[PDB]
Amino acid sequence: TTFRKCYERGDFPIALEHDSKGNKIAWKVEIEKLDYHHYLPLFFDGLSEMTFPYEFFARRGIHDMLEHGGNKILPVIPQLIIPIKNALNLRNRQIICVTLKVLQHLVVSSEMVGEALLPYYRQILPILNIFKNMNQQKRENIGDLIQETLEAFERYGGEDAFINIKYMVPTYESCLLN
Amino acid sequence: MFKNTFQSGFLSILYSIGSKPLQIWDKKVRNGHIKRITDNDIQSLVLEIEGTNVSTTYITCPADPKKTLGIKLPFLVMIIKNLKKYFTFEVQVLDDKNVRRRFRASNYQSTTRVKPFICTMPMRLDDGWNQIQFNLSDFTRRAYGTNYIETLRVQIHANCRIRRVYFSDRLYSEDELPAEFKLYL
Amino acid sequence: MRECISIHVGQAGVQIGNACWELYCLEHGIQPDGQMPSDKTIGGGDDSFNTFFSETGAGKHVPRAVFVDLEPTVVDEVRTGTYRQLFHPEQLITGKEDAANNYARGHYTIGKEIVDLVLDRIRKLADLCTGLQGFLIFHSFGGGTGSGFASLLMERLSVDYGKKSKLEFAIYPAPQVSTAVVEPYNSILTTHTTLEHSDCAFMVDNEAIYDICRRNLDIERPTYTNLNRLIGQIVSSITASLRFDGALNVDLTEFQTNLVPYPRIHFPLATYAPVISAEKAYHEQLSVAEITNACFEPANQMVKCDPRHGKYMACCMLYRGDVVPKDVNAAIATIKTKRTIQFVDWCPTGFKVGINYQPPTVVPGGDLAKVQRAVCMLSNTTAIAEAWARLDHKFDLMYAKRAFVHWYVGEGMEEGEFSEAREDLAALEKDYEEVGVD
Amino acid sequence: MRECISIHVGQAGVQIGNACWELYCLEHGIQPDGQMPSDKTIGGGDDSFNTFFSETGAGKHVPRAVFVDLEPTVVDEVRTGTYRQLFHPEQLITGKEDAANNYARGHYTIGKEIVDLVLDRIRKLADLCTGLQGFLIFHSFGGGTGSGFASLLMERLSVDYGKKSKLEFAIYPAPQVSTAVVEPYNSILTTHTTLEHSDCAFMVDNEAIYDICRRNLDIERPTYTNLNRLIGQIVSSITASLRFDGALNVDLTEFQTNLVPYPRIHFPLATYAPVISAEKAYHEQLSVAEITNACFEPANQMVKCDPRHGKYMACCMLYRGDVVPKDVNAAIATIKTKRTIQFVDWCPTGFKVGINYQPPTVVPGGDLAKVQRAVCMLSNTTAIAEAWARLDHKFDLMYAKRAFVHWYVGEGMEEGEFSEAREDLAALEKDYEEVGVD
Amino acid sequence: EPPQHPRYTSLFRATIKNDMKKFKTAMKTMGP
Amino acid sequence: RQRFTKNDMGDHYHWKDLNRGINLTVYGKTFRIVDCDRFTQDFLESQGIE
Amino acid sequence: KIPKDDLDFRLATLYNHHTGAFKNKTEILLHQETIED
Ligand SMILES: Nc1nc2c(ncn2[C@@H]2O[C@H](COP(=O)(O)OP(=O)(O)OP(=O)(O)O)[C@@H](O)[C@H]2O)c(=O)[nH]1
Ligand SMILES: Nc1nc2c(ncn2[C@@H]2O[C@H](COP(=O)(O)OP(=O)(O)OP(=O)(O)O)[C@@H](O)[C@H]2O)c(=O)[nH]1
Incomplete structure (x- = not known):
């Protein structure tokens, strides 16, 4: 893939910490005054990537700028769209679990997200619609994460959000008035 | 070629005092010459490339066409002495789309031409020892609206008086430059 | 409607156009006098002819063409020949000089005071046309006089009308045969002036058709009469899709779009399979499989x-003659099965079939055959760059010794054009090999 | 459907083919125009004639034979004859030099630049044909220009087509008539070059044909007109099975299988039974028993x-005309009961019988009779070795004094091949000696 | 070494070799 | 361009039957012949149609 | 091997049609070591 070679070449000053069996990280140059447009989706390609030690960077940094960078995602969303569905087609259980987690954090991160995402469901949803039900130690139940995603989504999405999600998902239920 | 090396710092590709500096520079000699001769102002050996026709005789990088350049830095500086003649040079790069593209700086050029695979630029300048400066991302952004990513080859033509070509990430000032970079007459 | 304009320049360029316009009077039976036999086709002028000839209520077809030249010899001989009553009187524009093979002489010195009249005539053709898909240009690379004038005309036509395609036919310089050493010079000038505004250029060479005439037509001493006849058949076969119809119909816009891939490279090569003597085709057989194998025959x-050496990138075929679609697609499938022909890995479909049923026409006193099936094949490939290699490694040396440059510089050009x-040219060859690279 | 090709080489190998087609036109009612009467008979070449003629929609029945020669004389004369309008023009292939009876000259010096064209013709028939059951090659062992050229083209076709039959028919070296002294050389060379690829080869002797013509045909001053007429009726008899039908039919595959026991020896003899003068047939009778007695007459x-001198392995009997299984089997039973003929003990049954209804045909201006019951006979036997023995010692004596080896080494060859x-030939012989020995 | 195969004396050497000479009287008949 | 059907079976208007002063129905709409031109009557009388 | 005229003319000519000119038919169609060279 392209992001792995991009960093193997090197343009991201990110530091780290580490110990016996667990997790932690650092960085070298701050993100807010570097960029959220020229580097956000390129780094997101690491999500579709699955290889040590690159996935560490992906899984964490994706959260990191989410906490640290709220009022900038506004225009970058169509660029964000692509690696999402690429990883979804990649069809790996662990990868899609990591996705589900980070996408959960994405939607809850800030405002305006669902309303701007209005044009952008018919590509992300239906593959999940079919992922619904193939199947708490470390949050491993695919189906539970799926219903959590739909739950956190629809109420914040808006008004016809649920009806279009329903049109995707014939099981789908209301979390609003039932 | 040497991708494993560090784009950090400065990249002198050719520098005159090198004993045998022509490895990765394929030469195409025709009705011309390559010569290695001192100057009067720097009174130091420099390269001289001349020929009857400039398209016939030209130096290029890399030597193996089956190899790329592999450079990230978007800033280029050449140390040239104008010789009151007809010189040009060429660079080819790979972009955000992964389609190849060329830039053609020609001293004669009477106009500016944009072709889907290559851009052209006239060169006019003073005499004596002067300098070249260019920004790959700048020009690609302005012309093709794409985003510079890496370099793949570079070619230089005749009618030129040569000290050093080098690359840098940014527009560097005049004081961080080493003494050999700090040209004096 | 589906009508256009024919433009002819250069005394070598004019005999071929003359033959073409003959073969265009043939099939619709336009008498050399100007009016039909007692049988009726005249009126407001709305049928297969209203595309090539304007036969308004006057009863005389006016060919929608203009011939221009600088040397009055050929234009006056055609003024005094057979079809002068048919040719519009001042549609035959004459100069009083020659360009002495100097491209810039033909461009700057004299072209300034004639472009006004020629553009006036073409605009007054524009008023009478309705759709006017465009122009058929007849000229030559090594234009002994017409090259520079034609380049200038094409540029100014491009700057005024950018909303219609240009299909052009220039006779390629003979690779190893030189009629004069000024041809590389004026050729390369024409190339750089035309490649960037020309739409679809087809090259033709005279040595190859000569060798064909001796090869299978079996005539050891061919002529311009014969060669012009054959190329007129070529252009008539292409314009048949315009005039008549068949199963489906195709058009020049499709030709350019489907044939030229990118900007720049729009230079396909021509072939016409069933060239054979009348006595040979009299008791030998013709069918789609063998004629297609012939059109691929080197x-x-x-x-x-x-x-x-090359590799194939696009192909179109126009089939004029009574045929059926299945065996066509079966034969082309067999070609797809074949191995040695090397298509590139970009277009798994690379063929533009066109069907028309009206038989290709014969000429009185001719050396063609009574055709029932014919296919004219256009193809764009990667093997032409070597000819440019030839012409540049010829150019370079004479440029290096700067021979004859005094003429051009004295008349007022500089080295920068060269x-x-x-x-x-180097750029063209390099992009050719690059797109050849997968 | 059912069909075969014909190839003719050697300056004297061509008048016999001329005769064969001058025959076939009659019984298929072909006129030297190449056209039938107005009765609905034309197609792509699909009717009774289709087995050897492609009569495309142009209504002309094209013979499926290629006539090649190294010298222009006989070929251009027949091109001036009364069938050039029929024949495919370049299917008559010309050279511009003789061979002077040297095998290696033709096989090496000149053959390499004509074989290409002839192979092209071979394939450009093999494309339109469908079944392609085999070939008929006509040549001459003591070739004036036949030996080397036929050998090399046979080798090329043997290595290009492993899935079809081949037929090799010719005049044999005369036992005691020496029309050209290098005959032993060229003969033995061709024998070795063919033994390892040959399928079925028939050998005939013009002296014996002369003798028959003298004996019972009531003719004493004959010509090739007569002799080639005879070989033509032979070829007609063998191809009748394909031309028409019968109570039972047989195929070239049937002869191939049922006639040759092993590899190696696959060279039979043939005989046409009812050879008779017109008045003799007028005032006697013919029928199955007596005609078979005559055919097996030594x-x-x-x-x-x-x-x-020897003994028989196998025999094939092809009966043209109107006969019945009853009398044919009764007659052959009498044949077997007869004590003179000796069949080898391996196969007490050794007979392959076949029938066709169509009577043999009389040619205008001919010399045959009005026959209604013809029978051709093919025999595979052991007496054949006598000719081989007769030739070998002429070979060895001229080898002993080593004359004209100067010719051969000068044209660039060595003696180890002879x-x-x-x-x-000795090994072929010892094969014969074992198979004869019981 | 492939031994030479005996030229088969199926008459011939005996018969035909003698006959070809016996049925000749040439070198005589145009006079001495 | 096509051929034309006289009667039901699939017949075809062979010129052997056409003359002046004839009417004919063709896919519904029926027509009448008035007169012809030079080569037409010359050829047709060369055949001999009265 | 060869199916027809196509593979014949395309495989075995050696007549580099750009290089040669003023030649004749037989010269146009010429094989390689396939024949003997
Ligand atoms: N179009 C065409 N070209 C021909 C014919 N016969 C020869 N030629 C070639 O066409 C070229 C003619 O170009 P030029 O001689 O420059 O023609 P021009 O520029 O109109 O002016 P002139 O030099 O006076 O003829 C020659 O190089 C010939 O090789 C022909 O019948 N038609
Ligand atoms: N097939 C055939 N053979 C004949 C005829 N007349 C004589 N012959 C014998 O058949 C042989 C034919 O071979 P060649 O004489 O070498 O003929 P060629 O090889 O085609 O060419 P040339 O060198 O011109 O003779 C002769 O040597 C004769 O002995 C004939 O009409 N037809």
Whole structure:
């Protein structure tokens, strides 16, 4: 893939910490005054990537700028769209679990997200619609994460959000008035 | 070629005092010459490339066409002495789309031409020892609206008086430059 | 409607156009007098003819063409020939001089005071046309006089009308045969002036058709009469899709779009399979399989190229004659099965079939055959760059000794045009090999 | 459907083919125009004639034969004859030099630049044909220009087509008539070059044909007109099974299988039974028993080998006309009960019988009779070795004094190949000696 | 070494070799 | 361009039957012949149609 | 091997049609070591 070679070449000053069996990280140059447009989706390609030690960077940094960078995602969303569905087609259980987690954090991160995402469901949803039900130690139940995603989504999405999600998902239920 | 090396710092590709500096520079000699001769102002050996026709005789990088350049830095500086003649040079790069593209700086050029695979630029300048400066991302952004990513080859033509070509990430000032970079007459 | 304009320049360029307009009066039976037999076709002028000839209520077809030249010899001989009553009187524009093979002489010195009149005539043709898809240009690379004038005309036509395609036919310089050593110069000038505004250029060479005439037509001493006849058949076969119809119909806009891939490279090569004597076709057989194999047969192509060396990128075929679709697609499937022909890995479909049923026409006193099936094949490939290699490694040396440049510089050009051209040529060959690279 | 190709080489190998087609036109009612009467008969070449003629929608029945020669004389004369309008023009292939009876000259010096064209013709028939059951090659062992050229083209076709039959028919070296002294050389060379690829080869002797013509045809001053007429009726008899039908039919595959026991020896003899003068047939009778007696009569065979010198392995009987299974089987039963003829003990049954209804045909201006019951006979036997023995010692004596080897080495060859050919023919012989020995 | 195969004396050497000479009287008949 | 059907079976208007002063129905709409031109009557009388 | 005229003319000519000119038919169709060279 392209992001792995991009960093193997090197343009991201990110530091780290580490110990016996667990997790932690650092960085070298701050993100807010570097960029959220020229580097956000390129780094997101690491999500579709699955290889040590690159996935560490992906899984964490994706959260990191989410906490640290709220009022900038506004225009970058169509660029964000692509690696999402690429990883979804990649069809790996662990990868899609990591996705589900980070996408959960994405939607809850800030405002305006669902309303701007209005044009952008018919590509992300239906593959999940079919992922619904193939199947708490470390949050491993695919189906539970799926219903959590739909739950956190629809109420914040808006008004016809649920009806279009329903049109995707014939099981789908209301979390609003039932 | 040497991708494993560090784009950090400065990249002198050719520098005159090198004993045998022509490895990765394929030469195409025709009705011309390559010569290695001192100057009067720097009174130091420099390269001289001349020929009857400039398209016939030209130096290029890399030597193996089956190899790329592999450079990230978007800033280029050449140390040239104008010789009151007809010189040009060429660079080819790979972009955000992964389609190849060329830039053609020609001293004669009477106009500016944009072709889907290559851009052209006239060169006019003073005499004596002067300098070249260019920004790959700048020009690609302005012309093709794409985003510079890496370099793949570079070619230089005749009618030129040569000290050093080098690359840098940014527009560097005049004081961080080493003494050999700090040209004096 | 589906009507256009024919433009002819250069005393070598005019005999071929003359033959073409003959073959265009043939099929609709336009008498050399100007009016039909007692049988009726005249009126407001709305049928297969209203595209080539304007026969308004006057009863005389007016060909929608203009012939221009600088040397009055050929234009006056055609003024005094057979079809002068048919040719519009001042549609035959004459100069009083020659360009002495100097491109810039033909461009600057004299062209300034004639472009006004020629553009006036073409605009007054524009008023009478309705759709006017465009123009058929007849000229030559090594234009002994017409090259520069034609380049200038094409540029100014481009700057005023940018909303219609241009299909052009220039006779390629003979690779190893030189009629004069000024041809590389004026050729390269024409190339750099035309490649960037020309739409679809087809090259043709005279040596190859000569060798064909001796090869299978079996005539050891061919002529311009014969060669012009054959190329007139070529252009008539292409314009048949315009005039008549069949199963489906195709058009020049499709030709350019489907054939030229990118900007720049729009230079396909021509072939016409069933060239044979009347006595041979009299008791030998013709059908789709063998005629297609012929159109791929290396001797049948009119450019000094090795399709083995090259690789194929696009192809169109126009089938004029009583045929059926299945065996066509079956034969083309067999070609797809074949191995040695090397298509590139970009277009798994690379063919533009066109069907028309009206038989290709014969000429009185001719050396063609009573055709029932014919296919004219156009193809764009990667093997032509070597001819440019030939012409540049011929150019370079004489440029290096700067021979004859005094003529051009004294008349008022500089070296920069030549400079420009040499790297343009290098650029062309390099992009050719690059797109050849997968 | 059912069909075969014909190839003719050697300056004297061509008038016989001329005669064969001058025959076929009659019984298919073909006129030297190439056209039938107005009765609805034309197609792509699909009717009774389709087995050897492609009569495309142009209504002309094209013979499926290619006539090649190294010298222009006979070929251009026949091109000036009364069938050039019929024949495919370049299917008559010309050279511009003789061979002077040297095998290696033609096989090496000139053959390499005509074989290409002839192979092109071979394939450009093999494309339109469908079944392609085999070939008929006409040549001459003591070739004036036949030996080397036929050998090399046979080798090329043997290595290009492993899935079809081949037929090799010719005049044999005369036992005691020496029309050209290098005959032993060229003969033995061709024998070795063919033994390892040949399928079925028939050998005839013009002296014996002459003798028959003198004996019972009531003719004493004959010509090739007569002799080639005879070989033509032979070819007609063998191809009748394909031309028409019958109670039972057989195929070239049937002869191939049922006639040759092993590899190697696959060279039979043939005989046409009812050869008779017109008045003789007028005032006697013919029928199955007597005609079979005549056919197995030793002297009416066309090879100077006495059957009582040896013994028979196998026999094929092809009956043209109107006969019945009853009398044919009764007659052959009497034949077997007869004590003179001796069949080898391996196969007490050794008979392959076949029938066709159509009577044999009389040619205008001919010399045959009005026959209604023809029978051709093919025999595979052991008496054949006598000719081989007769030739080998002429070979070895001229080898002993080593004359004209200067010719051969000068044109660039060495003696080890003739050395080979000696023991090669000896090995074929020892094969014959074992198979004869019980 | 492939031994030389005996030229088969199926008469011939005996018969035909003698006959070809016995049925000749040439070198005589145009006079001495 | 096509051929034309006289009667039901699939017949075809062979010129052997056409003359002046004839009417004919063709896919519904029926027509009448008035007169012809030079080569037409010359050829047709060369055949001999009265 | 060869199916027809196509593979014949395309495989075995050696007549580099750009290189040669003023030649004749037989010269146009010429094989390689396939024949003997
Ligand atoms: N179009 C065409 N070209 C021909 C014919 N016969 C020869 N030629 C070639 O066409 C070229 C003619 O170009 P030029 O001689 O420059 O023609 P021009 O520029 O109109 O002016 P002139 O030099 O006076 O003829 C020659 O190089 C010939 O090789 C022909 O019948 N038609
Ligand atoms: N097939 C055939 N053979 C004949 C005829 N007349 C004589 N012959 C014998 O058949 C042989 C034919 O071979 P060649 O004489 O070498 O003929 P060629 O090889 O085609 O060419 P040339 O060198 O011109 O003779 C002769 O040597 C004769 O002995 C004939 O009409 N037809």
